[PDB]
């Protein structure tokens, strides 16, 4: 049966072929396809009060 932990796969994609790297060292090797990385983790989808309040205020505007 489905999970009930409000967790979903969070996909992050990285294309740093322009050579601009982030502060953290590589976590996989990009030998053969420099600059490209796919990251996946399971993260809880947190409640976001600001977004909920904005829909309540703004739903009538496209």
Partner 1 sequence: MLDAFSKVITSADGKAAYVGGADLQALKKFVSDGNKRMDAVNAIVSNASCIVSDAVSGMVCENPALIAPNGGVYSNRKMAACLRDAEIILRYVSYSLLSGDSSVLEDRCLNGLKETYASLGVPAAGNARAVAIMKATVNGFINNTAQQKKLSTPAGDCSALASEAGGYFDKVSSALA
Ligand X SMILES: *[C@H](C)[C@H]1/C(=C/c2[nH]c(/C=C3N=C(/C=C4\NC(=O)C(CC)=C4C)C(C)=C\3CCC(=O)O)c(CCC(=O)O)c2C)NC(=O)[C@@H]1C
Interface positions, 21-50, toward partner 1 (CB under 8 A): 26-33, 36-43, 45-50
Site track 3-42 with ligand X (rule: CB under 6 A), x = hit: xxxxxx----xxxx---xxx-x-xxx-x----xxxxx---
CB of 36 to ligand DBV, least distance (A): 25
38 lies in the site for ligand DBV, by CB under 6 A: no
The label of the residue with tokens 């205020």 reads: 57
2 lies in the site for a copy of itself, by CB under 8 A: no
41, 9 Cβ separation under 8 angstroms: yes
34, 18 Cβ separation under 8 angstroms: no
Nearest alpha carbon to residue 24 among 46, 39, 42, 6: 39
């Amino acid at each position: 049966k489905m999970a009930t932990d409000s967790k979903a796969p969070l996909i992050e994609l990285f294309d740093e072929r322009d050579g601009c790297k982030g502060p953290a060292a590589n976590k996989a090797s990009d030998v053969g396809e420099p600059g490209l990385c796919v990251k996946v983790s399971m993260q809880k989808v947190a409640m976001n009060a600001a977004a909920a309040k904005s829909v309540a205020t703004n739903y009538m505007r496209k």
